[PDB]
Write a protein that binds this DNA or RNA. Sequence first.
DNA 1: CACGGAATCCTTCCCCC
DNA 2: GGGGGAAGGATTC
Length: 341
Amino acid sequence: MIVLFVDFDYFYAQVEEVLNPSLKGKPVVVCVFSGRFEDSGAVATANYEARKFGVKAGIPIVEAKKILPNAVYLPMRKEVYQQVSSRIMNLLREYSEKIEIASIDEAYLDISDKVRDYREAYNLGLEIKNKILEKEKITVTVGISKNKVFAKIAADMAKPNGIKVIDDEEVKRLIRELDIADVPGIGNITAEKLKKLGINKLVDTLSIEFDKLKGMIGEAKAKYLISLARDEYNEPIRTRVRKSIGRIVTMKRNSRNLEEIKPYLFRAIEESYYKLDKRIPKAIHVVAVTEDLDIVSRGRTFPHGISKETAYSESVKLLQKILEEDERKIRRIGVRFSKFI
DNA sequence: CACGGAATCCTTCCCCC
DNA sequence: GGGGGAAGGATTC
Ligand SMILES: Nc1nc2c(ncn2[C@H]2C[C@H](O)[C@@H](COP(=O)(O)OP(=O)(O)OP(=O)(O)O)O2)c(=O)[nH]1
Ligand SMILES: [Ca+2]
Ligand SMILES: [Ca+2]
Ligand SMILES: [Ca+2]
Protein backbone atom coordinates (compact mmCIF):
# COMPACT_ATOMS: atom_id res chain seq x y z
CA MET A 1 0.00 0.00 0.00
CA ILE A 2 1.54 3.26 -1.19
CA VAL A 3 -0.09 6.64 -0.64
CA LEU A 4 1.13 9.85 -2.21
CA PHE A 5 0.03 13.10 -0.53
CA VAL A 6 0.27 16.45 -2.32
CA ASP A 7 0.23 19.73 -0.40
CA PHE A 8 0.61 23.05 -2.32
CA ASP A 9 3.13 25.50 -0.85
CA TYR A 10 1.84 28.68 0.89
CA PHE A 11 -1.02 28.33 -1.56
CA TYR A 12 -3.06 31.56 -1.39
CA ALA A 13 0.12 33.63 -1.40
CA GLN A 14 1.72 31.59 -4.20
CA VAL A 15 -1.34 32.06 -6.41
CA GLU A 16 -1.13 35.82 -5.90
CA GLU A 17 2.53 35.58 -6.97
CA VAL A 18 1.65 33.50 -10.04
CA LEU A 19 -0.91 36.17 -10.98
CA ASN A 20 1.63 38.97 -10.35
CA PRO A 21 5.27 37.69 -10.59
CA SER A 22 6.74 41.03 -9.55
CA LEU A 23 5.70 40.02 -6.01
CA LYS A 24 8.10 37.07 -6.10
CA GLY A 25 10.94 37.33 -3.58
CA LYS A 26 9.07 39.91 -1.47
CA PRO A 27 7.03 39.21 1.68
CA VAL A 28 3.40 38.68 0.65
CA VAL A 29 0.52 38.66 3.15
CA VAL A 30 -2.97 37.47 2.11
CA CYS A 31 -5.48 38.96 4.56
CA VAL A 32 -9.12 38.69 5.56
CA PHE A 33 -10.36 42.22 6.41
CA SER A 34 -13.26 42.22 8.90
CA GLY A 35 -14.18 45.87 8.37
CA ARG A 36 -14.49 46.64 12.11
CA PHE A 37 -11.69 49.21 11.77
CA GLU A 38 -8.44 50.16 10.06
CA ASP A 39 -6.70 46.87 9.23
CA SER A 40 -8.95 44.79 11.48
CA GLY A 41 -8.84 41.13 10.55
CA ALA A 42 -6.59 38.11 10.34
CA VAL A 43 -3.92 36.77 8.00
CA ALA A 44 -5.13 33.83 5.89
CA THR A 45 -1.55 32.93 4.94
CA ALA A 46 1.78 34.44 3.91
CA ASN A 47 4.75 33.38 1.80
CA TYR A 48 8.00 32.27 3.41
CA GLU A 49 9.65 35.69 3.05
CA ALA A 50 7.08 36.92 5.54
CA ARG A 51 6.94 33.75 7.68
CA LYS A 52 10.58 33.87 8.66
CA PHE A 53 9.78 37.06 10.59
CA GLY A 54 6.77 35.64 12.43
CA VAL A 55 4.02 36.68 9.98
CA LYS A 56 1.73 33.68 9.47
CA ALA A 57 -1.84 32.41 9.23
CA GLY A 58 -3.93 33.35 12.24
CA ILE A 59 -2.16 36.43 13.59
CA PRO A 60 -3.96 39.81 13.41
CA ILE A 61 -3.31 41.99 10.40
CA VAL A 62 -2.40 44.88 12.73
CA GLU A 63 0.37 42.79 14.31
CA ALA A 64 1.69 41.63 10.95
CA LYS A 65 2.08 45.26 9.92
CA LYS A 66 4.04 46.23 13.03
CA ILE A 67 6.52 43.47 12.18
CA LEU A 68 6.62 43.94 8.41
CA PRO A 69 5.25 47.43 7.72
CA ASN A 70 6.57 47.31 4.14
CA ALA A 71 5.28 43.91 3.04
CA VAL A 72 2.58 43.57 0.40
CA TYR A 73 -0.88 43.07 1.91
CA LEU A 74 -3.55 41.58 -0.32
CA PRO A 75 -7.23 40.76 0.28
CA MET A 76 -7.93 37.04 0.10
CA ARG A 77 -9.55 36.00 -3.20
CA LYS A 78 -10.96 32.53 -2.33
CA GLU A 79 -12.81 31.96 -5.64
CA VAL A 80 -9.63 32.48 -7.68
CA TYR A 81 -7.59 30.09 -5.54
CA GLN A 82 -10.40 27.57 -5.71
CA GLN A 83 -10.37 27.57 -9.50
CA VAL A 84 -6.58 27.24 -9.65
CA SER A 85 -6.89 24.47 -7.09
CA SER A 86 -9.46 22.65 -9.24
CA ARG A 87 -7.18 22.71 -12.27
CA ILE A 88 -4.39 21.20 -10.21
CA MET A 89 -6.63 18.45 -8.84
CA ASN A 90 -7.53 17.54 -12.43
CA LEU A 91 -3.82 17.10 -13.20
CA LEU A 92 -3.37 14.78 -10.23
CA ARG A 93 -6.37 12.71 -11.36
CA GLU A 94 -4.36 11.64 -14.40
CA TYR A 95 -1.98 9.88 -12.03
CA SER A 96 -4.57 7.77 -10.21
CA GLU A 97 -8.30 7.13 -10.38
CA LYS A 98 -8.24 6.78 -6.60
CA ILE A 99 -7.85 10.33 -5.27
CA GLU A 100 -8.97 12.02 -2.06
CA ILE A 101 -9.34 15.80 -2.26
CA ALA A 102 -8.98 16.69 1.41
CA SER A 103 -9.08 20.50 1.09
CA ILE A 104 -8.48 23.43 -1.25
CA ASP A 105 -4.81 22.47 -1.36
CA GLU A 106 -4.35 18.86 -0.14
CA ALA A 107 -4.89 15.55 -1.92
CA TYR A 108 -4.01 11.90 -1.40
CA LEU A 109 -3.46 9.48 -4.25
CA ASP A 110 -3.57 5.72 -3.93
CA ILE A 111 -0.79 4.81 -6.36
CA SER A 112 -0.46 1.20 -5.20
CA ASP A 113 -1.03 0.00 -8.78
CA LYS A 114 0.85 2.62 -10.82
CA VAL A 115 3.98 1.84 -8.81
CA ARG A 116 5.69 -1.31 -7.53
CA ASP A 117 7.96 0.22 -4.87
CA TYR A 118 9.08 3.40 -3.14
CA ARG A 119 11.84 4.16 -5.64
CA GLU A 120 9.24 4.37 -8.39
CA ALA A 121 6.86 6.25 -6.08
CA TYR A 122 9.51 8.93 -5.54
CA ASN A 123 9.96 9.30 -9.32
CA LEU A 124 6.21 9.61 -9.82
CA GLY A 125 6.32 12.32 -7.18
CA LEU A 126 8.96 14.31 -9.05
CA GLU A 127 6.94 13.79 -12.21
CA ILE A 128 3.86 15.23 -10.46
CA LYS A 129 5.80 18.13 -8.98
CA ASN A 130 7.28 19.00 -12.37
CA LYS A 131 3.97 18.69 -14.15
CA ILE A 132 2.25 21.09 -11.73
CA LEU A 133 5.13 23.58 -11.78
CA GLU A 134 5.21 23.62 -15.59
CA LYS A 135 1.42 23.69 -16.08
CA GLU A 136 0.38 26.13 -13.34
CA LYS A 137 3.76 27.35 -12.12
CA ILE A 138 3.00 26.32 -8.56
CA THR A 139 5.37 24.43 -6.28
CA VAL A 140 4.06 21.71 -3.97
CA THR A 141 5.38 19.28 -1.37
CA VAL A 142 5.01 15.53 -1.77
CA GLY A 143 4.79 13.02 1.06
CA ILE A 144 4.90 9.27 0.42
CA SER A 145 4.31 6.37 2.77
CA LYS A 146 2.29 3.33 3.84
CA ASN A 147 -0.91 5.23 4.63
CA LYS A 148 -2.58 8.64 4.52
CA VAL A 149 -1.38 9.70 7.95
CA PHE A 150 2.33 9.10 7.42
CA ALA A 151 2.06 10.39 3.87
CA LYS A 152 0.90 13.70 5.36
CA ILE A 153 3.57 13.59 8.09
CA ALA A 154 6.10 13.04 5.30
CA ALA A 155 4.98 16.23 3.51
CA ASP A 156 5.02 18.19 6.77
CA MET A 157 8.63 17.19 7.21
CA ALA A 158 9.82 18.03 3.69
CA LYS A 159 8.15 21.38 3.07
CA PRO A 160 8.39 23.70 1.35
CA ASN A 161 8.87 22.53 -2.24
CA GLY A 162 10.01 19.08 -1.18
CA ILE A 163 9.27 15.39 -1.57
CA LYS A 164 9.81 12.61 0.94
CA VAL A 165 9.32 8.92 1.46
CA ILE A 166 8.72 7.44 4.90
CA ASP A 167 9.56 3.75 4.61
CA ASP A 168 8.33 1.01 6.93
CA GLU A 169 11.64 1.25 8.74
CA GLU A 170 11.07 4.93 9.51
CA VAL A 171 7.41 4.50 10.37
CA LYS A 172 8.51 2.45 13.38
CA ARG A 173 11.11 4.94 14.58
CA LEU A 174 8.48 7.69 14.22
CA ILE A 175 5.91 5.68 16.21
CA ARG A 176 8.44 5.82 19.03
CA GLU A 177 10.14 9.13 18.28
CA LEU A 178 7.48 11.52 16.91
CA ASP A 179 5.92 14.09 19.22
CA ILE A 180 2.28 12.92 19.36
CA ALA A 181 1.26 16.54 18.86
CA ASP A 182 2.68 16.29 15.35
CA VAL A 183 0.19 13.55 14.50
CA PRO A 184 -2.67 14.78 12.24
CA GLY A 185 -5.98 15.04 14.04
CA ILE A 186 -4.21 15.94 17.26
CA GLY A 187 -4.77 19.62 18.02
CA ASN A 188 -3.85 21.65 21.12
CA ILE A 189 -6.73 20.34 23.24
CA THR A 190 -6.14 16.66 22.54
CA ALA A 191 -2.36 17.00 22.93
CA GLU A 192 -2.67 18.56 26.37
CA LYS A 193 -5.12 15.85 27.43
CA LEU A 194 -2.63 13.24 26.19
CA LYS A 195 0.19 14.92 28.15
CA LYS A 196 -1.67 14.61 31.44
CA LEU A 197 -2.01 10.90 30.63
CA GLY A 198 1.74 10.61 30.12
CA ILE A 199 1.47 9.98 26.37
CA ASN A 200 4.02 12.09 24.45
CA LYS A 201 4.65 9.61 21.63
CA LEU A 202 2.34 7.32 19.69
CA VAL A 203 4.20 4.48 21.39
CA ASP A 204 2.85 5.62 24.77
CA THR A 205 -0.76 4.89 23.74
CA LEU A 206 -0.25 1.17 24.29
CA SER A 207 0.92 1.59 27.89
CA ILE A 208 -2.53 2.84 28.88
CA GLU A 209 -5.84 1.06 29.42
CA PHE A 210 -8.13 1.61 26.43
CA ASP A 211 -11.24 2.58 28.40
CA LYS A 212 -9.26 5.23 30.27
CA LEU A 213 -7.99 6.61 26.95
CA LYS A 214 -11.48 6.47 25.44
CA GLY A 215 -12.85 8.24 28.48
CA MET A 216 -10.32 11.02 28.04
CA ILE A 217 -10.26 11.73 24.30
CA GLY A 218 -13.16 9.74 22.94
CA GLU A 219 -13.41 6.31 21.37
CA ALA A 220 -12.96 7.37 17.74
CA LYS A 221 -9.81 9.28 18.64
CA ALA A 222 -8.57 6.45 20.88
CA LYS A 223 -8.90 3.74 18.23
CA TYR A 224 -7.29 6.08 15.71
CA LEU A 225 -4.11 6.65 17.76
CA ILE A 226 -3.90 2.98 18.80
CA SER A 227 -4.06 1.66 15.24
CA LEU A 228 -1.31 4.07 14.21
CA ALA A 229 0.87 3.12 17.17
CA ARG A 230 0.39 -0.56 16.32
CA ASP A 231 1.38 0.23 12.73
CA GLU A 232 -2.07 -0.95 11.64
CA TYR A 233 -3.79 2.29 10.51
CA ASN A 234 -5.05 1.60 7.01
CA GLU A 235 -7.89 3.83 5.82
CA PRO A 236 -8.78 3.97 2.10
CA ILE A 237 -8.51 6.99 -0.23
CA ARG A 238 -12.13 8.04 -0.78
CA THR A 239 -13.73 10.91 -2.69
CA ARG A 240 -15.32 13.17 -0.08
CA VAL A 241 -18.58 14.95 -0.91
CA ARG A 242 -19.86 18.38 0.14
CA LYS A 243 -22.35 17.88 2.96
CA SER A 244 -22.94 21.49 3.99
CA ILE A 245 -22.59 24.99 2.55
CA GLY A 246 -22.62 28.15 4.64
CA ARG A 247 -21.28 31.61 5.29
CA ILE A 248 -20.55 33.72 8.37
CA VAL A 249 -19.77 37.44 8.41
CA THR A 250 -18.54 40.02 10.91
CA MET A 251 -20.67 43.01 11.84
CA LYS A 252 -19.08 46.45 12.15
CA ARG A 253 -20.28 46.64 15.76
CA ASN A 254 -21.51 43.92 18.12
CA SER A 255 -25.27 43.82 18.66
CA ARG A 256 -28.43 42.33 20.14
CA ASN A 257 -30.82 44.32 17.97
CA LEU A 258 -32.71 41.94 15.67
CA GLU A 259 -33.16 44.61 12.98
CA GLU A 260 -29.48 45.49 13.09
CA ILE A 261 -28.39 41.88 12.70
CA LYS A 262 -30.92 40.78 10.03
CA PRO A 263 -29.01 42.43 7.14
CA TYR A 264 -25.82 40.48 7.81
CA LEU A 265 -27.84 37.29 8.28
CA PHE A 266 -29.83 37.72 5.07
CA ARG A 267 -26.65 38.57 3.19
CA ALA A 268 -25.11 35.29 4.43
CA ILE A 269 -28.18 33.36 3.31
CA GLU A 270 -27.97 35.02 -0.11
CA GLU A 271 -24.35 33.98 -0.66
CA SER A 272 -25.08 30.55 0.78
CA TYR A 273 -27.92 30.01 -1.67
CA TYR A 274 -26.01 31.25 -4.69
CA LYS A 275 -23.38 28.67 -3.71
CA LEU A 276 -25.79 25.79 -3.16
CA ASP A 277 -26.35 25.81 -6.94
CA LYS A 278 -29.04 23.16 -7.61
CA ARG A 279 -28.48 21.48 -4.24
CA ILE A 280 -31.47 21.64 -1.88
CA PRO A 281 -30.99 21.46 1.90
CA LYS A 282 -33.45 20.04 4.40
CA ALA A 283 -31.55 21.55 7.34
CA ILE A 284 -30.62 25.07 8.38
CA HIS A 285 -28.52 26.34 11.26
CA VAL A 286 -28.03 29.91 12.39
CA VAL A 287 -24.52 30.36 13.79
CA ALA A 288 -23.40 33.21 16.01
CA VAL A 289 -20.03 34.24 17.36
CA THR A 290 -20.62 36.04 20.67
CA GLU A 291 -18.58 39.07 21.71
CA ASP A 292 -16.25 36.78 23.69
CA LEU A 293 -15.53 34.72 20.57
CA ASP A 294 -17.79 31.92 21.77
CA ILE A 295 -19.83 30.02 19.13
CA VAL A 296 -23.55 29.32 19.64
CA SER A 297 -26.06 27.88 17.18
CA ARG A 298 -29.70 26.96 16.68
CA GLY A 299 -31.00 24.97 13.76
CA ARG A 300 -33.88 22.99 12.38
CA THR A 301 -34.28 20.01 10.09
CA PHE A 302 -37.34 19.91 7.81
CA PRO A 303 -39.02 16.80 6.30
CA HIS A 304 -38.63 18.45 2.88
CA GLY A 305 -36.18 20.81 1.16
CA ILE A 306 -35.87 24.47 2.20
CA SER A 307 -37.03 27.18 -0.22
CA LYS A 308 -35.23 30.52 0.02
CA GLU A 309 -38.31 32.19 1.51
CA THR A 310 -38.47 29.45 4.17
CA ALA A 311 -34.79 30.01 4.98
CA TYR A 312 -35.27 33.74 5.51
CA SER A 313 -38.26 33.08 7.74
CA GLU A 314 -36.84 30.17 9.72
CA SER A 315 -33.47 31.90 10.23
CA VAL A 316 -35.08 34.89 11.94
CA LYS A 317 -36.79 32.58 14.43
CA LEU A 318 -33.52 30.75 15.15
CA LEU A 319 -31.73 34.08 15.64
CA GLN A 320 -34.46 35.15 18.09
CA LYS A 321 -34.02 31.84 19.86
CA ILE A 322 -30.29 32.58 20.16
CA LEU A 323 -30.80 36.09 21.56
CA GLU A 324 -33.42 34.82 24.01
CA GLU A 325 -31.29 31.97 25.35
CA ASP A 326 -27.95 33.82 25.34
CA GLU A 327 -27.59 37.33 26.77
CA ARG A 328 -24.16 38.16 25.33
CA LYS A 329 -23.90 40.51 22.36
CA ILE A 330 -23.23 39.02 18.91
CA ARG A 331 -20.04 39.70 16.93
CA ARG A 332 -20.30 37.39 13.90
CA ILE A 333 -23.53 36.02 12.42
CA GLY A 334 -24.24 33.46 9.71
CA VAL A 335 -25.96 30.34 8.44
CA ARG A 336 -25.20 26.81 7.31
CA PHE A 337 -27.32 24.53 5.11
CA SER A 338 -27.02 20.75 5.16
CA LYS A 339 -28.85 17.45 4.60
CA PHE A 340 -29.05 17.86 0.84
CA ILE A 341 -31.76 15.97 -1.01
C1' DC B 1 -5.83 42.23 18.28
C1' DA B 2 -7.94 36.73 16.15
C1' DC B 3 -11.25 35.76 9.63
C1' DG B 4 -13.05 32.06 7.76
C1' DG B 5 -15.35 26.96 5.55
C1' DA B 6 -16.51 22.45 6.76
C1' DA B 7 -16.12 17.33 8.50
C1' DT B 8 -16.53 14.53 12.22
C1' DC B 9 -17.19 13.09 16.61
C1' DC B 10 -19.25 13.59 21.58
C1' DT B 11 -23.36 14.38 24.93
C1' DT B 12 -27.70 14.82 25.86
C1' DC B 13 -32.24 14.28 24.95
C1' DC B 14 -36.34 12.01 22.96
C1' DC B 15 -39.57 8.40 20.68
C1' DC B 16 -40.49 3.79 20.77
C1' DC B 17 -40.18 -1.26 20.57
C1' DG C 1 -31.73 -2.16 26.83
C1' DG C 2 -30.94 -0.35 22.56
C1' DG C 3 -31.84 1.22 17.59
C1' DG C 4 -32.62 5.86 15.16
C1' DG C 5 -32.41 10.62 14.86
C1' DA C 6 -31.99 15.39 15.99
C1' DA C 7 -29.64 19.34 18.62
C1' DG C 8 -26.03 21.96 20.27
C1' DG C 9 -21.28 21.92 21.19
C1' DA C 10 -16.26 20.39 20.89
C1' DT C 11 -12.16 19.91 18.02
C1' DT C 12 -9.37 19.99 14.01
C1' DC C 13 -7.58 21.22 9.52
N1 LIG D 1 -8.87 32.52 6.15
C1 LIG D 1 -7.94 31.62 6.51
N2 LIG D 1 -7.39 30.78 5.59
C2 LIG D 1 -6.46 29.94 6.14
C3 LIG D 1 -6.06 29.86 7.49
N3 LIG D 1 -5.10 28.89 7.69
C4 LIG D 1 -4.94 28.40 6.52
N4 LIG D 1 -5.72 28.97 5.49
C5 LIG D 1 -5.56 28.49 4.16
C6 LIG D 1 -4.07 28.87 3.99
C7 LIG D 1 -3.63 28.19 2.78
O1 LIG D 1 -3.67 28.98 1.60
C8 LIG D 1 -4.57 27.00 2.79
C9 LIG D 1 -3.90 25.98 3.75
O2 LIG D 1 -2.65 25.39 3.57
P1 LIG D 1 -1.71 25.47 4.96
O3 LIG D 1 -2.01 24.06 5.19
O4 LIG D 1 -2.56 26.59 5.42
O5 LIG D 1 -0.60 25.76 4.00
P2 LIG D 1 0.06 27.10 3.39
O6 LIG D 1 -0.01 26.71 1.95
O7 LIG D 1 -0.41 28.44 3.66
O8 LIG D 1 1.45 26.71 4.03
P3 LIG D 1 2.68 25.93 3.43
O9 LIG D 1 3.92 26.91 3.20
O10 LIG D 1 2.38 25.48 1.97
O11 LIG D 1 2.98 24.72 4.22
O12 LIG D 1 -5.63 27.10 3.83
C10 LIG D 1 -6.62 30.74 8.44
O13 LIG D 1 -6.37 30.80 9.64
N5 LIG D 1 -7.59 31.61 7.85
CA1 LIG E 1 -0.17 23.99 1.99
CA1 LIG F 1 -2.44 21.94 3.43
CA1 LIG G 1 -0.75 19.45 16.15
